[PDB]
Amino acid sequence: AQTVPYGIPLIKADKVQAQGFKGANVKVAVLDTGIQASHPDLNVVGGASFVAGEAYNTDGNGHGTHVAGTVAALDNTTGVLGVAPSVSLYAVKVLNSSGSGSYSGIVSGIEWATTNGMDVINMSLGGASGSTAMKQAVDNAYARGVVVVAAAGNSGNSGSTNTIGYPAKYDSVIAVGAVDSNSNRASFSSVGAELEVMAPGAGVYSTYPTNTYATLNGTXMASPHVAGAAALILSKHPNLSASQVRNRLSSTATYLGSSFYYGKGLINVEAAAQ
Ligand code: NA
Ligand code: NA
């Protein structure tokens, strides 16, 4: 009936859901291409669109629905199961159906999340360059107590070259890498002095536009696993500042190898929310 993607047990998330920690009442914004609100295995509680011509509750591309799915697909008997099934999900469309969006459209997106009280902000987007405003936008969301998690990048390792992208590159933002189901790092995963943790990214199955589920690859898939893990930790220890949460994710991580390719290693929501 319900499929449990490899990532859920990979990061010990299933152990936490067992204790009864599902991330209920935690507000999480997915800053992506929108979310097919009508998907049965998903429940968007609200949000906003900073993209012209399209509401936030529609996904013209598929990316946003897949990512939102990894964070909180309903713990029911249909489709998949997400990392934090009881999270209050927010669709913040800042990327058009082509998967591209402006610095401003994104900054506005981040601005809305903080002002509207999201405890976690997920950004599975990024590019070769950043912005003075974007930098400011994330440092404040963070100073304001939100957990900003972003995708590291699908730029492979170009030697000793830093392929980590923005917004990830910033220090107030968590740069997530990608591992397969074997816990080995996936080839597309970006390498850099900023790679912070690794989460499932290869062959991630989740909800997908027009009431179905697909398998995709990318650090974009890795990212909603830590945003999902932040949610469980916060549901367990509510009065935990963003920094404490950030620390327990990295600190407790399962070492796999060199931090330039792994950061602190694979995550372990169970050790983290301890
Ligand atoms: Na489900
Ligand atoms: Na960062």
Tokens coding 91: 């669709």
Determine phi and psi for 134, rounding to 5 degrees: -60, -45
Q: How far is the CA of 2 from the centre of ligand 2 (A)?
A: 34
Cα of 95 vs centre of ligand 1, distance in Å, is 25
Contact, 181 vs 147, CB < 8 A?
no
The answer, yes or no, to whether the previous bond of 238 is cis (omega within 30 of 0) is no
d(CA 66, CA 2) in angstroms, rounded, equals 16
Q: Where are the beta strands (DSSP E) in 140-261?
A: 147-151, 174-179, 197-200, 204-208, 212-216
Residues 6+ apart with CB under 8 A from 132: none
Q: How was this structure determined?
A: X-ray
What is the distance of C-alpha 79 from the center of its chain?
A: 20
Question: Are the CB atoms for 242 and 145 separated by under 8 Å?
Answer: yes
- DSSP assignment of 218-231 equals SHHHHHHHHHHHHH
Gap between the Cα atoms of 156 and 152, Å rounded: 10
Burial group, residue 255, by CB count within 10 angstroms (0-12, 13-18, 19+) = exposed
| Resolution reading in Å | 2.6
Phi-psi region of 203 (alpha: psi -120 to 50; beta: other; left: phi over 0): left
Exposed / middle / buried, residue 147 (Cβ in 10 Å: 0-12, 13-18, 19+): buried
Strand duo 44-49 + 27-32: pairing: unpaired
| Sheet of strand 44-49, all strands in order from the earlier edge strand to the far edge | 44-49, 88-93, 27-32, 120-123, 147-151, 174-179, 197-200
Copy the structure tokens of residue 249.
């994710």
Under a CB-based contact definition with an 8 Å cutoff, are residues 248 and 226 in contact? Answer: no
Distance 238 CA to ligand 2 centre (A): 24
**Residue 175 marked ligand-binding:** no
Domain of residue 109: give its range.
Answer: 1-274
Q: What is the C-alpha separation between 235 and 256, in angstroms, rounded?
A: 28
Q: What is the DSSP-derived secondary structure letter of residue 204? A: E
DSSP 3-state of 68 = helix
> 81 C-alpha to center of ligand 1: Å?
4
DSSP state of 266: B
Smallest-distance ligand from the CA of 263 = 2
As beta bridge partners, residue 48 has 92
Ligand nearest to the CA of 170: 2
Which CATH number covers residue 162?
3.40.50.200
Q: Are 182 and 11 in contact (CB under 8 A)?
A: no
**Residues contacting residue 56 through CB under 8 Å, at least 6 positions apart:** 34, 35, 44, 47, 48, 49, 91, 92, 93
**CA–CA separation, 21 vs 14, rounded Å?**
10
Q: Which two tokens stand for residue 245?
A: 């949460």
Helices (H), 55-123: 63-72, 103-115
Nearest to 109 by CA among 166, 162, 32: 32
Cross-strand partners of 200: 179
Does 252 count as an annotated binding residue? no
Q: Determine the Cα–Cα distance for residues 188 and 202; give it in Å rounded to an integer.
A: 9
If you measure from the C-alpha of residue 226 to the centroid of ligand 1, how many angstroms do you get, rounded to a whole number? 19
3-state secondary structure the chain: CCCCCCHHHHCCHHHHHHHCCCCCCCEEEEEECCCCCCCCCCCEEEEEECCCCCCCCCCCCCHHHHHHHHHHCCCCCCCCCCCCCCCEEEEEECCCCCCCCCHHHHHHHHHHHHHCCCCEEEECCCECCCCHHHHHHHHHHHHCCCEEEEECCCCCCCCCCCCCCECCCCCCCEEEEEECCCCCECCCCCCCCCCCEEEECCCEEEEECCCEEEEECCHHHHHHHHHHHHHHHHHHCCCCCHHHHHHHHHHCCECCCCHHHHCCCECCHHHHCC
Greatest extent of the chain over all pairs of C-alpha atoms, in Å: 47
Confirm or deny that 136 is annotated as ligand binding. Answer: no
Tokens coding 216: 């995709």
Helix (H, G, I), strand (E, B), or coil: what is residue 148? strand
Ligand having the closest approach to the CA of 79 = 1
Residues designated as active site:
32, 63, 220
- Residue 271's alpha-carbon distances to 13, 32, 57, 184, 268, in angstroms, are 10, 29, 35, 20, 5
Known binding residue 170? Answer is yes
In the structure, how many helices (H) and strands (E) does the chain have? Answer: 9, 9
DSSP 8-state code for residue 78: S
User: 132-143 vs 103-115: helix axis angle to the nearest 10?
Assistant: 10
Coil, strand, or helix at residue 101?
A: coil
Looking at the 3D structure of the chain, how many domains does it have? 1
Measured N-to-C along each axis, helices 63-72 and 219-236 cross at an angle, to the nearest 10 degrees, of 30
